[PDB]
Amino acid sequence: ATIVALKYPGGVVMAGDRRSTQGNMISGRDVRKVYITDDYTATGIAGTAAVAVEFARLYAVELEHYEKLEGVPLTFAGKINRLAIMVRGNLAAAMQGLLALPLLAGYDIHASDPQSAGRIVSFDAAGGWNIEEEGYQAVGSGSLFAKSSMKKLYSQVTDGDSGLRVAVEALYDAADDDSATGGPDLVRGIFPTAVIIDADGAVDVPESRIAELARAIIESRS
Amino acid sequence: ATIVALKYPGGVVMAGDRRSTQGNMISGRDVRKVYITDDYTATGIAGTAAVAVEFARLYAVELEHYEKLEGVPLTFAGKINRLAIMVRGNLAAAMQGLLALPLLAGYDIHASDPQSAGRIVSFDAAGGWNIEEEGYQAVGSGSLFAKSSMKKLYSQVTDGDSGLRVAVEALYDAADDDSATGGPDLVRGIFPTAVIIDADGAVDVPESRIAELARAIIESRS
Amino acid sequence: ATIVALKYPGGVVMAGDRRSTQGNMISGRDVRKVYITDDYTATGIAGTAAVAVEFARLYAVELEHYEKLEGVPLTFAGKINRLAIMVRGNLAAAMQGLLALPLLAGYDIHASDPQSAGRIVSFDAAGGWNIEEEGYQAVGSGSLFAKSSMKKLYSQVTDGDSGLRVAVEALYDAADDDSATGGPDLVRGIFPTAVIIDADGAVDVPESRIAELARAIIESRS
Amino acid sequence: ATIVALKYPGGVVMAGDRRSTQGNMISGRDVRKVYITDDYTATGIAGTAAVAVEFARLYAVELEHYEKLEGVPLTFAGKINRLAIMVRGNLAAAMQGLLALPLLAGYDIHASDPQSAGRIVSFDAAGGWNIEEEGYQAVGSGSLFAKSSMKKLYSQVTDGDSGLRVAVEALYDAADDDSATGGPDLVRGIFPTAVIIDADGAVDVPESRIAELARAIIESRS
Amino acid sequence: SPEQAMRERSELARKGIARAKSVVALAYAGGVLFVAENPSRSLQKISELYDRVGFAAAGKFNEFDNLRRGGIQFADTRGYAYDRRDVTGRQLANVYAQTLGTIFTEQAKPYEVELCVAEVAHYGETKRPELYRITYDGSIADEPHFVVMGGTTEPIANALKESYAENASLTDALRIAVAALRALGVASLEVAVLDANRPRRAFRRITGSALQALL
Amino acid sequence: SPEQAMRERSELARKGIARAKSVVALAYAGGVLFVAENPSRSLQKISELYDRVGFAAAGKFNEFDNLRRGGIQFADTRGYAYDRRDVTGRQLANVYAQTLGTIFTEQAKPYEVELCVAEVAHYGETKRPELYRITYDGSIADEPHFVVMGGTTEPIANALKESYAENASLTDALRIAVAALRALGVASLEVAVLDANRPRRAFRRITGSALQALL
Amino acid sequence: SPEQAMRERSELARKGIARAKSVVALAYAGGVLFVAENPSRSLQKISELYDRVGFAAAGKFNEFDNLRRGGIQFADTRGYAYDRRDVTGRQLANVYAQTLGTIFTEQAKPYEVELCVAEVAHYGETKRPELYRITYDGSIADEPHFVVMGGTTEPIANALKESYAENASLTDALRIAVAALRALGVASLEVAVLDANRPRRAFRRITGSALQALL
Amino acid sequence: SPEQAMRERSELARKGIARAKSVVALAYAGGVLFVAENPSRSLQKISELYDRVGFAAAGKFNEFDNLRRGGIQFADTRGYAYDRRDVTGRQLANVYAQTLGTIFTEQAKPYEVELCVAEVAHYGETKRPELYRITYDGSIADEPHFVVMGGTTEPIANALKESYAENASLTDALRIAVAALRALGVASLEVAVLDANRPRRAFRRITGSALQALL
Amino acid sequence: SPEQAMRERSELARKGIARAKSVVALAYAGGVLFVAENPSRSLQKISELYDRVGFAAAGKFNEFDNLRRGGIQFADTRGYAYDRRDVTGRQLANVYAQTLGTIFTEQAKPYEVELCVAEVAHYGETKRPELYRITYDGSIADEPHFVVMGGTTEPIANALKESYAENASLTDALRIAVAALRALGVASLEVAVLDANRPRRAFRRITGSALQALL
């Protein structure tokens, strides 16, 4: 399990792997771990799937409920506070073993500079949150390898396509260096899913672009 | 994590480092640990960040709530009592491992001598509080080194700039003698944050002055 | 931590040290441990400071509340019963480690003989109380040394000054024989605090008299 | 701690030692352990003082409350039942270590034979009670030695003075054979306290008679 | 208007007790004798509360049945708490008065009952029998010789005031009680006594051929 | 209309107390003397609340019996809490006033009782006796010499206002109290005193041949 | 008859508010200005609810004091829950309307108060001030320029309808408000403003020599 | 009809307070002086609430006794919570107003009391004394110089409005207060002062020979 | 008499709704169009309950605001429990009818509201819009084409019965609705639609220049 997210001028990208493992045996091959909560942010949870899907659904439901009740969407700080409270409320279950660490990436429509409106937030096991400002952040088992790869590869990010390519390459490096992370599948045609958030909203990247990027990266590495 | 505070004629200064470490790996490089609760006092908490930010926000909210309800600000003794109660109420979580030791520095506007109106209060893990009167106090992992440095360097404190320089030098010594404390960063341009409280209120020290002080100290030590 | 109290004809004296130690490291140098609850008695608590100050404040508040409600002060037996109940109610916290053993000294205005109206009461960890009648009692870590010194020195007590000198000498002996007890400080000018209770009420001994007594004792011991 | 009680024609006597020990160190030298609840019975509790005084006060208060409410004193069986319930209700605290074993001696005014109206009742740790009929009973740490001494010395009991002398001699033997029991003090003038209950009520034995009896016993043993 | 409500409740209670039959309780040389007009045998208006205490009532069966059950529970709990010898009829009469007063005050319909508590001396001890009467509103009183309740009690009260001599035998007391109640065979008559000659339990029921032989 | 309800409740309470008998309490040279008209011996209108406190009441037996039990429980709990010497009759009178006011306000029927609390000095200490009177609505007052309650108290109040001298002996005080109550042998009379000469408990009952010898 | 009870409650509330003094709130070029007739200084009819929200009321002091305390607690809890920027005066006005309606419906006496909630724009942002009025029955309304409450408000309403120009300065707004209230020195006048020029907290009190210099 | 019930409750409260005696409280050069008409010594109408706060009331003793106890508990709890210097008489007056309003609204009988809260300056600090008056319905008000309550207060109000000069001495203030109350020796007079010259506790009782020497 | 109370409650509710303004809801070729007379912009009489459900009401603002909040909570909880596609407007209309009936029965004042629930087809599925009307007493009904509520609805009901053609465009439907409401510019008009062409959420607000261009 590895989820990466980096900031590019005018938006933010988010991607994750598609592998679920029960110990050392592979259980899933195309598991989806990146979800869209509402128009201008997406979340990704690494850990137990049973807690991850529940957290995603509950976060989306709470955001929609508040928006319907008050008539206006929550501010970014309010969303961060709600997610932090949700994470903190599961500390006992995390101690038992039901651990889920989410990653939040969104676009701030109430920012003076649209080019620097992208935000990346990481959460701790105890509920603490920190706003990422180095331009990238990764979570999961292979987070360290992906973070090092992004540290070296962030100099080539200029637009959305460059950021997507860097994210795919970081995921490939994490899968190469970690046995719990699943790389691109050229036999079954399974590729990581990505979400791009910009001023127009959050959209889902088509599988064709990710397939071409993965094929190009594999050819280059050969 | 190291936070220092010393008393100078006519006010009080407060500063802290900008390092967060998850065990032995560095997680943050510009973490802010000094906060302003209201006009005439500032607080600094060393320990778990998830508890530190919550404590700062709750203390500020309680002070503002009391001021709005009664129409007058709380006395310094009342603020100390409230902070001590808040610290004491978290003893079980501290025993489990969620420990947070705050440091309180403020200015007493109801004192006969304005030059001696600065106050420094330290809190224990069990909720006990003691008013500091040696002129300085430090908390955190590298508190001992900073306290020794301030013991030797307190003879040169005459005004606000001298106190700020002494605090920065003590933080530098603590970072030198402790691997969990982050010193000044000349590559990324990260410097410790400081807050100065005087008769006119509590203000935030600009980063430029701290940068010049750190550069001068580094040049002198070379 | 050492608090001593002895009886002299026409009153009672009470004194304690000014040292707080966190394990083996010195944390405080002028900590006050003797407090005045109301007009005709004073109390002294040895142990955890966070519990000691709370106990002193709560005892004073309860006594004042009863006096205001009923219009008359409580009898000495009632005060002893209230203090014993307060001590007994903290037995679980004492078992965990939050132990506080108070010492009560007061003047009985409802006694036939004014010269024998002084009272000294000691309390156990389980809430049991015993009225001291040997003429002296000490509590704290160095209680045994002070008690032996008072056993030898009680023959010279004739009035208030003699009792104060004997108490100061006993505190000096306890500090000499115990590393957790702080003796007189001739560099920083820190001296133990004393309270004298007589028919006119409870008053605080000025620091000058204690300083002269300590200097005379030090000169004699040289 | 040792409390003895024996039956003589026309009444019953009760006596106890005056020593309190905190482990192996002596804490008290004239501790009183025999108390008078009401007119025609007295009680003595051996063990923790903090529980003993509380039990004595509570038993006296309950007896007085019942007498005031109903207008007539409780029967002896009712008093035994109340004391047994009180002892049984403290079994958990006794298991932790707060053990208190009381001894009850009284005079039955509703008996056909006034000469055989004396009663001695002993209580167990679980609340069980048994009416003593051998003519004597002892409780405390040195109960066995005192019981053996009374077994040999009961043949000389004819009246109140003989019973008092036998009780004092048994206490002296228990103090001789046990280091936790305090014998007569010829230096400080401390002697055991005794209570005599007869048809006229329960009275306190003056210290002079006990002093003469102890001096005579000491002279005889020399 | 509290006065009107109290008056109406008192009138209702008096009318309810007035239609009930008469039960007579008196003390003789061997304790307290209870005589009642009771046709059925399944229903008993005379019972035993403790070793030396007795119960008697007149009115609606369920109300004094509940009062009797509560009194038995109170007596047994008090005896188990302190001692069996610490229970007296005075406590039962007091708690009955309090309960009847509370019912009269804070209930929709006042209780149409009238209770009597009779206590005798303990075995081997000489003491005079004590009788207590409790009314519907909770009033308590002490009666030295006899207690008469239920219905038109004036003729029976007069007939027991006159021609009554203390220290009488069981047979003479029974004859006097029956004569006063008439102003009557084995059937429709309930007879119970509190025999102080008994060691522990003083309650006894006289029924069958023994009752016929008595009168 | 609260005024009408309050007036009717006050009238009901006054009529209830007016039919009750008169009980007289006065202070003499050795404490406080209580004299009451009580025919039965099982029922007592005079009791003891604490070591130096006394109780007296007139009206419905159950109501002041409950008040007496509550006062005893309060006194014993307060004595066990702080000390035996920290209990005074002022606290008992205040709590009785509050309880009677609460009953008068938030109960269907007001209590038809009138209580008096008498406290004496502790042994070895000189102080004048203090008497407090509490009415049905919870009113409290301080009376220096005597307290008269129950029924037509005007003639007894006049007879104790006149021909009364302080510092009198027990015999003279008893004679004056009996004379004022008449305006009366061993039977139907309840006599109790608060003897300050006693070390701890000052309550004493005078009955039997001693009462006859007294008057 | 619910209609009669509702009519009587409305009449009582209207009579209660009618005897109260008049408080005037209006919006000028720099926020919202509050002017009230308040002789004492310990009692304040104008307060601050949050960073950009204000409070104003007229009527019985305790009722709107309680409402103010509840509003402050609600605002602080909501700010601590989600964020400080997620609190608006609309939520406070809605909860106040619900609370006043609940009081009017399910309470013995309706509240004789009339509240106004005024919110201003956040620092660095341009937006027009919003004023809300809540009546005794819980009615809510939106007023564009000014809100007038308390007593005979018709002359002041006319005087503020006429000769009122938006975007006015603080001095001119204060003079117009005082002139309309008269139809008046430092004493007996309460003046507060919502200064949008302030970074975080927009509430300010104008008292002393500054108020005298203003007018 | 809420109007009729409110009118009847107000009339009942006014009639209850009107029969009570008059208590006068005024401020002099050294604090606040309390003078009351109180014959008994066990009952006190003047008390101390905190270090610098005072209490005064007139009416039924139990009601303001309960209010006093509640105020003391509130003051002590607030002082132990935040600080001893964070307690002011304004908070006590506000909570008293709320409690009296709640009693007037949701109780069968309104409280027939009238309270005054007087606060003085802390030692070493100069500030003018503040007096607050609370009525039966919960109304609150601020009085600059004197507060007069209880009974026919019009003549005393006139006599204190006229011939009253601030900054007066204790003796002159006592003489003026006694003269206004008459329009009176050591007995039947209660005198208490709030001495700001005292370091921590400003409450003092003047009784005995000192009171006689004063006047 | 339940009949009289029910009649008076119904009359009160009818009079309350009769003074309210008229809100018109109708279904066109692309969903359901809501048109309301609403001068203020802070207050909204038209809202969204779920993805394909809509809300509309007329009357007292707080009552239907509370009903709207409860409906939103119910819808969200039901969607989170089973699925988002398992929520229909029929369930919301039924729970609203039950809640309104319970309020009408067991509350002091009946709710003066009239709600309408409009549901549209899911994206990619063809189905006719369904409208439900709920009255103050909890009555439920199904209306095929249009729902008219609030005030004198007879002329608008006639004007929408006549000259109404289904499958009309948004512009024609808006013009017909405005014409029937008149029998009216951007201000004082609230317009909302349920656009079935939208993939997930069908609620849309038409305000500003778009509304002016529409009509």
Swiss-Prot record, chains A, B, C, D:
Comment field on protein domains: In contrast to Rhodococus, the M.tuberculosis proteasome does not require the propeptide of PrcB for correct folding and assembly.
Q: What keywords are assigned to this protein?
A: Autocatalytic cleavage, Cytoplasm, Hydrolase, Phosphoprotein, Protease, Proteasome, Threonine protease, Virulence, Zymogen
Primary location: cytoplasm
Q: Where is this site: Covalent link with the inhibitor MLN-273?
A: 1
Q: In which pathway does it act?
A: Protein degradation; proteasomal Pup-dependent pathway
Put simply, this protein is called Proteasome subunit beta
Question: Electron transport as a keyword?
Answer: no
Task: Indicate whether Phosphoprotein appears among the record's keywords.
Answer: yes
As for what it does, the entry says: Component of the proteasome core, a large protease complex with broad specificity involved in protein degradation. The M.tuberculosis proteasome is able to cleave oligopeptides not only after hydrophobic but also after basic, acidic and small neutral residues. In complex with the ATPase Mpa, degrades protein targets conjugated to a prokaryotic ubiquitin-like protein (Pup). Among the identified substrates of the M.tuberculosis proteasome are the pupylated FabD, PanB and Mpa proteins.
The annotated modulation of its activity is: The formation of the proteasomal ATPase ARC-20S proteasome complex, likely via the docking of the C-termini of ARC into the intersubunit pockets in the alpha-rings, may trigger opening of the gate for substrate entry. Interconversion between the open-gate and close-gate conformations leads to a dynamic regulation of the 20S proteasome proteolysis activity. In vitro, chymotryptic and tryptic activities of the proteasome are both completely inhibited by epoxomicin and by the peptidyl boronate inhibitor MLN-273. Also inhibited by Mg(2+), Ca(2+) and SDS.
Subunit structure comment from the entry: The 20S proteasome core is composed of 14 alpha and 14 beta subunits that assemble into four stacked heptameric rings, resulting in a barrel-shaped structure. The two inner rings, each composed of seven catalytic beta subunits, are sandwiched by two outer rings, each composed of seven alpha subunits. The catalytic chamber with the active sites is on the inside of the barrel. Has a gated structure, the ends of the cylinder being occluded by the N-termini of the alpha-subunits. Is capped by the proteasome-associated ATPase, ARC (Mpa).
**Catalytically driven reaction(s):** Cleavage of peptide bonds with very broad specificity
Family membership noted in the UniProt record:
Belongs to the peptidase T1B family.
Question: How does biotechnology exploit this protein, per its UniProt record?
Answer: In the course of search for new antibiotics, a class of oxathiazol-2-one compounds has been identified that selectively inhibits the M.tuberculosis proteasome over the human proteasome and that kills non-replicating M.tuberculosis.
GO biological process: one example = proteolysis involved in protein catabolic process
Question: What are the subcellular locations of this protein?
Answer: Cytoplasm
PTM field: The unprocessed form of PrcB is phosphorylated by PknA. Processing of PrcB is greatly retarded in the presence of H(2)O(2).
| Full protein: residues contained | 58 to 279 of 291
| A Gene Ontology cellular-component term | proteasome core complex, beta-subunit complex
Identify the EC number(s).
Answer: 3.4.25.1
Catalytic site residues?
1
From Swiss-Prot, chains E, F, G, H, I:
> What keyword terms does UniProt attach to this protein?
Acetylation, Cytoplasm, Phosphoprotein, Proteasome, Virulence
Describe the applications of the protein. In the course of search for new antibiotics, a class of oxathiazol-2-one compounds has been identified that selectively inhibits the M.tuberculosis proteasome over the human proteasome and that kills non-replicating M.tuberculosis.
Q: In what pathway does it function? A: Protein degradation; proteasomal Pup-dependent pathway
* Gene knockout outcome: Cells lacking the core proteasome prcBA subunits exhibit reduced growth and persistence in mice. They are also attenuated in interferon-gamma-deficient mice. They also display increased sensitivity to reactive nitrogen intermediates (RNI) and increased resistance to oxidative stress.
SUPFAM superfamilies registered for this protein in UniProt = N-terminal nucleophile aminohydrolases (Ntn hydrolases) (SSF56235)
Query: Where would you find the membrane-spanning parts of this chain?
Result: none
Name a single GO cellular component. Answer: peptidoglycan-based cell wall
MF terms from GO for this chain are: threonine-type endopeptidase activity
**What function is annotated for this protein?**
Component of the proteasome core, a large protease complex with broad specificity involved in protein degradation. The M.tuberculosis proteasome is able to cleave oligopeptides not only after hydrophobic but also after basic, acidic and small neutral residues. In complex with the ATPase Mpa, degrades protein targets conjugated to a prokaryotic ubiquitin-like protein (Pup). Among the identified substrates of the M.tuberculosis proteasome are the pupylated FabD, PanB and Mpa proteins.
Q: Name the protein family.
A: Belongs to the peptidase T1A family.
Query: By what name is this protein known?
Result: Proteasome subunit alpha
Upper taxonomic lineage: Bacteria, Bacillati, Actinomycetota, Actinomycetes, Mycobacteriales
Q: Which gene encodes it?
A: prcA
